[PDB]
Swiss-Prot record:
Catalyzes the reversible hydration of carbon dioxide. Can also hydrate cyanamide to urea. Stimulates the chloride-bicarbonate exchange activity of SLC26A6. Essential for bone resorption and osteoclast differentiation. Involved in the regulation of fluid secretion into the anterior chamber of the eye. Contributes to intracellular pH regulation in the duodenal upper villous epithelium during proton-coupled peptide absorption. The gene is CA2. Pfam families: Carb_anhydrase (PF00194). Zinc. Can also use cobalt(II) with lower efficiency, but not copper(II), nickel(II) and manganese(II). Keywords: Acetylation, Cell membrane, Cytoplasm, Disease variant, Lyase, Membrane, Metal-binding, Osteopetrosis, Phosphoprotein, Zinc. The modification Phosphoserine is found at residues 162, 169. This is Carbonic anhydrase 2. GO terms for molecular function: arylesterase activity; carbonate dehydratase activity; cyanamide hydratase activity; zinc ion binding. The active site is at residue 61. Changing residue 196 to H: Higher affinity for bicarbonate. Enhanced proton transfer capacity. CDD domains: alpha_CA_I_II_III_XIII (cd03119). It is an enzyme of class 4 (lyase). Transmembrane segments: none annotated.
Amino acid sequence: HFGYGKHNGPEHWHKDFPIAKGERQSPVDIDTHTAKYDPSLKPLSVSYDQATSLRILNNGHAFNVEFDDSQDKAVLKGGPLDGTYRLIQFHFHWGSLDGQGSEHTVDKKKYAAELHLVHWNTKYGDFGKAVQQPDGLAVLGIFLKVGSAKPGLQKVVDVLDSIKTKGKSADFTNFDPRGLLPESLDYWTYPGSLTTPPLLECVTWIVLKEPISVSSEQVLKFRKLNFNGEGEPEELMVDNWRPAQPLKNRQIKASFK
Ligand SMILES: [Zn+2]
């Protein structure tokens, strides 16, 4: 399919996925001085109290924590959104060094990692239908900086040894994603795309202004994962981020001044 190496990384993706050079690709640099404050934007409503996590999976590109999305248990509403979006999975992107790893940048600043909480619009019935629609997905993006540990992340870090290689999965129940949220829900929002193939332009991005802090030891453990399957040559899962793409004909809006 695709990868992040010299011979199959983001600069090559357009050959198999021509939408890679499309009009509403992600990630982008958020220029904080040109972003438009929009007083019409509502506060985000994050209702994760009834979330049911199921499983954690190394898919060869990242690790996903998957949720039961067969009912309205963990949903995102409000903000720039119309209707109700259900949480299906979260994952991260990270670097080989603390100075890189995020996909979005803020005034060209990179963070150590970026967390993506992926939600789909319930009007379309399932995730597969939702990705074919311009308002199909909402992805909440949260930056990670290295500093103090995030206690709510530790359950994730501890299980990574069990899913080291591609295709491995493990039961992962009773995880509360509320422990990964910053104090403030102020955000930027713009229309974009998935940042991995198939790169579909179906995402309303909601990128939180406030980063969360994780410890050096926590992010070090992400870097021990493998892109490869068991029994194949070891290649460390690091730098699984796509570089910033042109903004083109889009405006970034801010919920705050
Ligand atoms: Zn992502």
